[model samples]
Target: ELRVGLEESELWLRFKELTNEMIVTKNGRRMFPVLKVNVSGLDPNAMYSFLLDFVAADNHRWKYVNGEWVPGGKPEPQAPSCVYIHPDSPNFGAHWMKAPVSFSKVKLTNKLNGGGQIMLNSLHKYEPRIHIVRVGDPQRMITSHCFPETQFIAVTAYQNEEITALKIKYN
Candidate 1:
């Protein structure tokens, strides 16, 4: 059995209310209020790997108009995606449960040539999903989970002024 839970639901909701927007650059931008989670109910003898990837929440491209997100139209074709695999993967279940799992190193970038960086379209909504893969004696099991409150829009520039102010206030 496998279980996963978001670490900070309340804090994530607050950012969602302001229409959380993540800044992506040609270089890459580390996500703020990073995706943190807790794992439990795992087999103690099994080795586990933690992975993170982002998916488009909707098909529509978005624009910030009058302080809100509006459908801009169909988005450009999605770029090739990359998964941010945890450095401490394949560890025993006890190791994962010992501390909160964090994907703070995962970054977002729009550059097509950003090797190993997760590619995302600007002004598009995305949901980050976490996957836990268990390496059994001979078989592997994978379970995934996502928190709606963690969904956000990726942008080259801050579309919502509120997001900018909030980021500045807290950062």
Candidate 2:
């Protein structure tokens, strides 16, 4: 009966209306709408580990055509999925069910490195995913949740000024 819901789903929708864009800095930048979620229905005594990852949305490279994003061409060598293990993981399911999980510390970067910050290619699309793993489960049935409204096109700069305005209002 474990279930998860995007915490700021409405806020995400506002960004989605304009086709969200995230700035992938060389040094690293925090995502504007940090992936926060609410959880419920976990066995109170069970232990759980929470993980986050970015999934490639598509194969096409994107370019802005007068505030419109379109598939411009092929994408760069896409990096493999980098799982961001929550620093507060491996807690009791009761703890998670009672808390508002936030991945606000996660960052995105185009620079190559071995670190906790997520790496991305500029002008590519990505979807945020949340994975839940129960400890000591023989079956190892890991569950993942994807929020399409949270998808964004990774970019070094905002494609349109409108994005900046929206982000500022809630950022």
Highest TM-score against the true fold, candidate: 2
What value does the lDDT take at residue 92 in candidate 2? Answer: 91
Model 2 CA deviation exceeding 4 Å by range: none
Q: For candidate 1, list the clashing residue pairs, or say none.
A: none
Overall lDDT per candidate, in order of appearance: 0.84, 0.88
Clash list (residue pairs), candidate 2: none
Model 2 deviation from native, Cα RMSD in Å: 1.1
Judging by lDDT against the true structure, name the best candidate.
Answer: 2
Tell me the tens digit of each residue's lDDT in model 1 across 1-171.
567888887878888998899999988889888888888898777788998989888878998888778898998887576788887897999999878898888779988665567888988899998888877646566788987889999999988787888787766
Per-residue lDDT over 1-171 for candidate 2, one digit per residue giving the tens place of the 0 to 100 score: 778999889999999989999998877888888888889998889999999999899978889997789898998887766889888889998888887899988889888665788998888989999999998999997999998999999999898789999988897
Worst 10 residues of 2 by lDDT: 109-118
Candidate 2 lDDT at 144 equals 92
Error of 2 at 107 (Å): 0.7
